[PDB]
Paper text:
Among the other titratable residues of the TMD, neither a mutation of E272Q nor E282Q produced an overall significant effect, albeit a significant negative ΔpH50 was observed for E272Q, which was previously reported to be nonfunctional when mutated to A. In contrast, the mutation of either E222 or E243 as Q or A, as well as [name], all produced significant loss-of-function effects, pointing to the key role of these residues in activation. Mutation of H277, which lies in the adjacent M3 α-helix (nearby E222) with possible electrostatic interaction, has also previously been shown, using noncanonical amino acid substitution to decrease the pH50. The structure of [name] was performed and was also found to have no apparent deviation from the apparently open pH 4 conformation, which further corroborates the several previously published works that show H277 does not appear to play a role in proton gating. Mutations at both entrances of the ion channel, E243 (outer ring) and E222/H277 (inner rings), as well as at the middle of the TMD within each subunit four-helix bundle (H235), produced significant decreases in proton sensitivity, but again here, the pattern of phenotypes does not allow discriminating between proton sensing and gating. The E222/H277 pair most likely confers the intracellular proton concentration sensitivity of the [name], which was reported from inside-out patch clamp experiments. The functional results indicate either a sensitivity to protons or a structural importance for both H235 and H277, neither of which are crucial for proton-elicited gating of the [name].
At present, the best structurally characterized pLGIC is the [name] [name] ([name]), of prokaryotic origin. Each subunit consists of an extracellular domain (ECD), predominantly in a β-sandwich fold, and a transmembrane domain (TMD) composed of four helices, labeled M1–M4. However, the [name] is a pH-gated channel, activated by lowering the pH, with a maximal activation at pH 4 and a pH50 around 5. We instead found that proton activation is a complex multiple loci mechanism, with the key contribution stemming from the coupling interface between the extracellular and transmembrane domain, with E35 acting as a key proton-sensing residue.
Numbering used by the authors:
A (entry chain A), B (entry chain B), C (entry chain C), D (entry chain E), E (entry chain D): 5 to 315
The structure:
């Protein structure tokens, strides 16, 4: 079976639609998500036209093997989609209506700059390669784009699922390709990060600052070094949920900055002890009293500066 | 092969049944479970009618390829089910009895609010899409719904496996869909959480309170900070077995609240030391004595309040 | 192809055999194991009978497609077995000898009560569903049941592989099922648990008891709290190799009991310090001296009681 | 279908091309990467020649089954590539133009000597085995070699994708093999290693050196041993992201060297304490003062020497 | 298609060869490795003989379906090999030359006694089952056994790939089986274990011995307990890379023995403190001075004894 022949010199328009049934497994490290959806295709094939009066039937059902079907592929998939044809219907004028249900692991880059307060635009790129007899061009049937109300992506809020209606037409190996961009806009449910990572991380930091109300070097060393090790455990925990980025994320910036605070608290604790041994406790008392104000104040201002640069 | 023709204007009724053979791998993080079951289907196709006198047999066996079979799909599966046809029996009136054995990874959301004392209703949604020639509607044969006595889901108790007998019939892409809800009610075996997470977590918390019977700042700092780090290890352990939820779980609430207790114990330990250095041990003694009662009392009342809000 | 016809009203006997080639991947958490074996089937088909004088041949080889073969399935498998037919031999009387090689992931529950000194009975349940024309019943050919001498299951000793010769015959969805139970008896190689978990766990416990020969609260607090944290690391290590059980395991019971010992050692260390501060060191000396005997004695007796309840 | 016949005694030239669509999952431990690309093949088959005047058509489309196609394989793949034929076009002279889209897990060794500041040359080796009737030789069509602009490999920068145009022609099992080398040059995005591993590791090292401004043995022991344990946690973290190499990596060398610094700081801390107890604090003061300069100076010079040997 | 008929009563000899293309994923825990190789087979089928004069052709190419091919299987594979036929060639006398490329996950036991200084002999067992018409026997064509020069097994050195030329002929389910043993001799690249596990483990052990030059119980307790916890972290790290063995490995023996050294150092530290409190520091000084020599001396001799028993 060959492609439908043109009346003039017009390309063949394959109208498309994607109806999401399931969204699952958004893997941040892999920058992938799994999708279960309906792919609907429609085009005119005059060779398939019939008279409903003469044939009796208003529509004709076909097996994929019996007719020409455009080879539609996904650009950003790991392996070719697992697809199962649901129906093929042909109106008297030869308008074919094809429907298949598929599943696919989609590869789509994520911007982690504002993590865990980030929003993403996931993409599903549909593509068709033209043949020598005909140039094939893709279109969007908006009445056939959508998602099931129950569609849930664990740890994310689905905002919208739309299609950029004008395809990106280009040459690849001296043949025309027509590409469509289906965009799934999502925003991360940041909630759990607050009681599990953010507040525990602040609590251990504030505990290290109790060393500014202590003259005991041994206890101070314990407070600052112990909490520093717990900070390292949180840094390791966070970086295991994320891929390695060539930029700084919001959480990464805070986590990094908090090390400087631990480092400066060790200097203070060291200086205090040194002065007391040198019989200068009055000078050490001045440094410790200033630290009580300076550490929370510089921490609050540094955080305002960071929140400003990132949001 | 086309669908069976109607006598009047009646939809074709495909009776269904699901008999569970195996339940395994309830993945809390993924919100999935694996199932191995029997899917039985039954419909009338009068085109398949036969006379046992003329044919010899009283029931005819068919290969799936030989006859029209309704395209029945699962809504909430990751990939299309692994299925193997066991039997296709046709009786003289044209009634077809179809039996297949399948295995599928089912995606079903879980409510972790009361974790690890939670119950869940797992769902298996069966669906059929109508054709232009006929509207296909699903029914439940209750005599064909059940589960093997040996069906065990590691770490869970299976309560019941029933079907909501009235299908959800609705429009989807200008065709009718008939959906059935099969519900597997389960409840978590909370037992192991007690000696492995809950009691160890309470023991280390009670150990931190021994600081209220000590005047040694160095020892108190070690007791409270060391046990706090062990609490962080339990928080990390717990959160690795759970997905990130946009709500607070019972365990999460307790784990979070216990940080406040560690934070306030550090303040007490700091205050006590400060007063002793300022030559006010009588005042410090009053605060430490009150803490001995206040900490267990507030811990018990806070826990009663939490158990009330969650149960 | 239809099933063989009966002479009288007798069921068709399908003689079975399982010869293990490989045993691997006993996953304790999943409660699964992987098997690579031979499945042999034997039944009589009179339609297939021939005279070896007239035909010349003593046996006839067949392709699966050419003859009727009973649909034999495994009950407790994750997915249907990956099978490859090795041979089909038909003798003059019509006795068919079928041989296939298969691989399957078998789901079989494990009793962890005596872990890591436990023995298990793994099961492979074979099943056949009867047809309308004939009732099919399973039998065991003992000469065709066995295992390769080289069959090794990493971390386990294989004791025996036998079959319960009488099938479980029962009705399921108004048809007869014939089920056979093939039992693989294994016992855990507990050896490695001794130098890697048990003895390290006892060493750190005995190290905490050195606090009974020390009057230094600061050092005592370090000894008891540090070793307690190492105990938590062993508890976490152990519980990651096991599924969550609605009962107590042997190791779990010991691990749990050892927490009580750490808790009571903290009370002793606290009491001793308190009395010394209250200028009562003679009383504290009496409690520490008793603890030196009481702690090992109660530890040994509690362990004897536990070993008795579990074995 | 047999291979095309030669005019003289010339080998059959199969022109090749690889156009990358997706690059993903560069697994450092496994030394593998996943690829989704176009494989284009072109050869002449005189048997397929036609007159475009007589046949009307300018090109002829074929199904793979209809014509002879060379068996082209990948050398360094885990399993055979998952391939789907896109097009087969035949010009009037008999020049066949074959295009397939494939996905493959490619096994390619990595040099970790300069990790995490390393560059790699990933290889995709194409091969063809000659037949008895004809010797098949591979060529590169440079116009059919390339990559999608959007091609991203998480944690890496793609520099170039080129082919070594001259094949490696060699005998293997008394038949000719023609092998082509497609090279994907990449360089690691080292950025994230700086705030997550390198700077945290230096901070804890500098914290241990504060012991050189302290006369408190107890505090010193805590500072040096605690930071040493945090170093061990970083060493373990790093070595889990890398395979075991029969050579030293850059990071490995630094991580190893830093242990010697911790070991010598423990000797210093021990010596100081010993002298103070022996009533020689003047001598200890001289050693501690020298260590304040010696430790950072030797650390800086040792690092210059290492950076020189590795870069 | 039936097997070739014998001239006399001679068995059918299938000559075999395995040429390794890729070796990868030697999983120590699973005791498996993945292989990508060529399997070549050769046998005589007189029914396939032709006159080169009459037919013109010197060799005849066949599709697997067209002729009888021996069912050759691998004994120690997880699942049946993924195989693709490269060529089937038939000389005029009827000698068939079959070549296929395959990939397989091979299950082969490993001896960890000398880990990480161990050598292994990996096995690939080829097998053929006899038929009633003929006894099929396997042979090795040594000119067709080998490996690609580029064959690399990450973390291992490949020494040789040879075949035990005489098959192990035996009865299995009343048919003769012909088995061949292909042996891949490898030796572990122990290098990385030295800077990553062995030297770090010795450094922390030597640090605990600095307690023998200290009279500070509090500091001693910190030194010995902190380093002991780091030893536990190394024990856990090592045992995660290895399966549980019913014997002691070299590393396991050293790791275990080092616990006894930590235990005895705690006794010494305890004894020293006890004597000082009892006003016997002269006696404690004698024990501490002896320990300075005794601990390194007993450590060196115990290690010589262990190296002797294991090598
Ligand atoms: C009378 C003192 C009360 C202390 C209350 C402290 C509340 C801190 C609120 C944290 C909010 C988030 C942040 C650092 C907290 C250190 C507190 C040290 C207390 C020392 C007391 C000295 C004795 C008079
Ligand atoms: C250490 C201190 C860490 C504090 C975290 C600050 C979070 C923040 O600043 O969050 C920022 C996000 C903003 O969401 P947005 O859509 O990206 O706004 C984009 C705005 N533009 C388009 C103008 C740039 O606000 C939230 O989610 C609100 C909840 C914050 C809870 C913090 C609890 C602590
Ligand atoms: C005579 C002292 C007996 C102590 C018994 C302690 C029982 C604890 C029961 C916990 C049950 C769960 C919870 C905090 C426990 C701290 C106990 C501190 C003891 C201090 C002793 C002072 C010297 C008189
Ligand atoms: C820190 C302290 C943690 C204490 C844990 C309290 C558990 C609890 O409150 O458990 C609650 C569950 C209730 O089960 P339910 O079916 O959800 O009751 C639903 C009731 N409605 C329908 C009326 C809302 O009771 C159990 O499982 C009993 C065993 C508890 C053992 C606790 C050991 C400690
Ligand atoms: C003279 C003292 C010898 C000590 C020998 C200790 C043997 C322990 C054997 C463990 C077997 C498993 C179990 C607790 C061990 C604590 C020992 C504390 C020693 C204190 C010494 C006091 C000074 C006289
Ligand atoms: C903390 C202290 C932990 C001590 C562990 C006790 C082990 C035990 O009691 O082991 C019990 C097992 C028994 O094997 P069984 O087949 O189940 O006997 C079943 C008997 N019936 C049928 C009569 C009930 O004996 C062993 O494996 C022997 C080796 C023990 C080594 C322990 C090293 C320490
Ligand atoms: C007056 C003292 C100021 C100290 C400033 C320290 C800056 C360190 C910069 C690191 C940058 C990378 C590196 C070791 C840091 C140890 C500092 C110890 C300070 C002791 C003070 C003694 C009292 C006079
Ligand atoms: C502990 C101290 C660790 C210091 C790390 C030094 C890094 C280095 O030396 O980095 C080396 C790489 C070089 O890149 P190259 O392409 O391999 O140069 C090859 C040159 N030839 C061909 C001449 C041999 O420079 C970078 O990436 C620059 C960024 C370094 C940031 C370091 C932050 C701290
Ligand atoms: C002046 C003392 C120099 C000591 C140098 C020690 C180097 C050890 C080399 C290890 C090689 C492997 C092994 C134990 C090391 C402990 C050393 C304690 C030093 C105490 C000094 C006392 C004050 C005179
Ligand atoms: C704690 C101390 C640990 C010391 C480790 C000793 C290693 C050893 O003894 O290694 C033994 C292996 C031997 O190799 P083999 O082939 O098995 O010799 C078999 C000999 N027969 C056939 C005679 C039995 O030598 C090596 O790899 C040499 C490198 C050792 C480096 C150690 C660095 C530290
Ligand atoms: Cl696709
Ligand atoms: Cl263009
Ligand atoms: Cl074009
Ligand atoms: Cl489905
Ligand atoms: Cl099965
Ligand atoms: Cl390939
Ligand atoms: Cl095989
Ligand atoms: Na088609
Ligand atoms: Na059908
Ligand atoms: Na059959
Ligand atoms: Na301490
Ligand atoms: Na072909
Ligand atoms: Na064959």
């Amino acid at each position: 079976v060959s492609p439908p022949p043109p009346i003039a010199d017009e390309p063949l328009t394959v109208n498309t639609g994607i109806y999401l049934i399931e969204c699952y497994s958004l893997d941040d490290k892999a920058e992938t998500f799994k999708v279960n959806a309906f792919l609907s295709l429609s085009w005119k094939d005059r060779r398939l036209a019939f008279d409903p009066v003469r044939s009796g039937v208003r529509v004709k059902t076909y097996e994929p093997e019996a007719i020409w079907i455009p080879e539609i592929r996904f650009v950003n998939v790991e392996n070719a989609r697992d697809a199962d044809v649901v129906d093929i219907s042909v109106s008297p004028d030869g308008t074919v209506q094809y429907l298949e249900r598929f599943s696919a692991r989609v590869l789509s880059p994520l911007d982690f700059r504002r993590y865990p307060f980030d929003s993403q635009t996931l993409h599903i790129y549909l593509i068709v390669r033209s043949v020598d007899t005909r140039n094939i061009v893709l279109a969007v049937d908006l009445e056939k784009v959508g998602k099931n109300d129950d569609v849930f992506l664990t740890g994310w809020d689905i905002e919208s699922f739309t299609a950029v209606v004008k395809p990106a037409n280009f040459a690849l190996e001296d043949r025309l390709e027509s590409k469509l961009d289906y965009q799934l806009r999502i925003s991360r449910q940041y909630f759990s990060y607050i009681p599990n990572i953010i507040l525990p991380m602040l609590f251990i930091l504030f505990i290290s600052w109790t060393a500014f109300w202590s003259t005991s070097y041994e206890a101070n060393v314990t407070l600052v070094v112990s909490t520093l090790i717990a900070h390292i455990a949180f840094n390791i925990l966070v970086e295991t949920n994320l891929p390695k980025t060539p930029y700084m994320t919001y959480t990464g910036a805070i986590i990094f900055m908090i090390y400087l605070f631990y480092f400066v608290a060790v200097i203070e604790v060291t200086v205090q002890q040194y002065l007391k041994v040198e019989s200068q406790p009055a000078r050490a008392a001045s440094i410790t009293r200033a630290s009580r104000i300076a550490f929370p104040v510089v921490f609050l201002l540094a955080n305002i500066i960071l929140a400003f640069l990132f949001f």
